[PDB]
Design a protein around this ligand. Structure first.
Ligand SMILES: O=P(O)(O)OC[C@H]1O[C@H](OP(=O)(O)OP(=O)(O)O)[C@H](O)[C@@H]1O
Ligand SMILES: [Mg+2]
Ligand SMILES: [Mg+2]
Length: 346
């Protein structure tokens, strides 16, 4: 492949041929691209409708340059709970709340992430405000997992940057498709996940890449535009299991959830979010606790999906019950406290 060949295909409004997105992303990752080639490719790839073949290639290459966790340190049934973000709603850190609740229910959670992209407070900022050590290395993430039930892979720590990245990001000033692939590049490679996507067309595509990984994932988009399962309206779920994709509309009303408003699910900065967490984990009832329950239960359903004999409404009932129980028994609050102690004693 070559730059003019790939770049010309893109400016011609064609999809890339097999191997070209990978070759391109790998030239960038090994320090073989000029800033103009980098910016051109990334931008053109942010504008063209995504496909599963190109997206799998970009993510596959990125994931090959990531730092793995030590051998046999990720349980088979580990889950991620993570969104692309990019949904411009500035919500309350639903994912990180759900992740603690999932882990407190007993399902291993290995998440990655970073600081906010455009939100007031990203999951990582919010963890940090709660006292949680965001910057552990592959060894201590693996001990976190083993001794707390949850580990957090900080993105800058697990994914190398590339030559010219700071100049390019500065100069272009916008996120690109390079920034939307996180769900697909978790360094621990959990096989289960609740994956929220702000862009429906990217989500469906990402559901196909997961499907081929044999992962058990619910890829989710609020029909209100949330990158989470929403309590405001229905959501679209691309339920991935046994190598196939089952796209369906989901209404949490089928399980007794009251309709909320977007306003009620809104976040603030890292302290405001850190306090919203303590409230929910301490028992505060309301629209936020509900959205947390719902997405936690979703992740538990993705987890149930690792057995071929999972049934949907029973997985869900059991997920809602386990997520609510984790809050109400104090398990989630006790886990957060344990997570804070862990990092402090190194
Ligand atoms: O700034 P934005 O582009 O809106 O994105 C907000 C955050 O959401 C994503 O993570 P995740 O889904 O894990 O975070 P959450 O806990 O806030 O849902 C991403 O890692 C950001 O940290
Ligand atoms: Mg999220
Ligand atoms: Mg979100």
């Amino acid at each position: 492949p070559s730059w003019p060949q790939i770049l010309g295909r893109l400016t011609d409004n064609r999809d890339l041929a097999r191997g070209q997105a990978a070759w391109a992303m790998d030239q960038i990752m090994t320090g073989n691209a000029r800033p103009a080639q980098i910016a051109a490719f990334a931008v053109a790839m942010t504008m063209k409708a995504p496909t599963a073949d190109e997206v799998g290639e970009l993510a596959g290459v990125m994931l090959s340059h990531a730092h793995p966790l030590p051998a046999d340190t990720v349980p088979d049934d580990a889950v991620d709970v993570v969104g692309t973000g990019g949904d411009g709603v500035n919500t309350v850190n639903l994912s990180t709340m759900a992740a603690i609740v999932v882990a407190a229910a007993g399902v291993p959670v290995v998440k990655h992430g970073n600081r906010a992209a455009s939100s007031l407070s990203g999951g990582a900022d919010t963890l940090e405000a709660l006292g949680v050590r965001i910057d552990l290395g592959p060894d201590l993430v693996a001990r976190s997992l083993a001794e707390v039930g949850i580990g957090f892979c900080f993105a800058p720590r697990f994914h190398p940057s590339y030559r010219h990245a700071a100049a390019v990001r500065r100069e272009i000033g916008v996120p690109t498709v390079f920034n939307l692939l996180g769900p697909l590049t978790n360094p621990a490679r959990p096989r289960a996940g609740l994956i929220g996507c702000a862009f429906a067309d990217l989500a469906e595509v990402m559901a196909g890449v997961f499907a081929a990984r044999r992962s058990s994932v619910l890829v989710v988009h609020g029909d209100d535009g949330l990158d989470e399962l929403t309590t405001t309206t229905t959501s679209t779920i691309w339920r991935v299991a046994a190598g196939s994709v089952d796209k369906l509309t989901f209404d949490p009303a089928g399980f007794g959830f009251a309709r909320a408003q977007l306003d009620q699910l809104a976040g603030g900065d890292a302290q405001a979010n850190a306090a919203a967490v303590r409230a929910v984990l301490g028992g505060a009832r309301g629209p936020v606790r509900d959205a947390v329950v719902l997405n936690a239960a979703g992740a538990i359903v993705a987890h149930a999906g690792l057995s071929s004999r999972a049934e949907w409404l029973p997985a869900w009932e059991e997920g809602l019950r386990r997520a609510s129980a984790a809050i109400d028994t104090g398990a989630a609050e006790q886990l957060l406290a344990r997570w804070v102690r862990f990092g402090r004693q190194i």
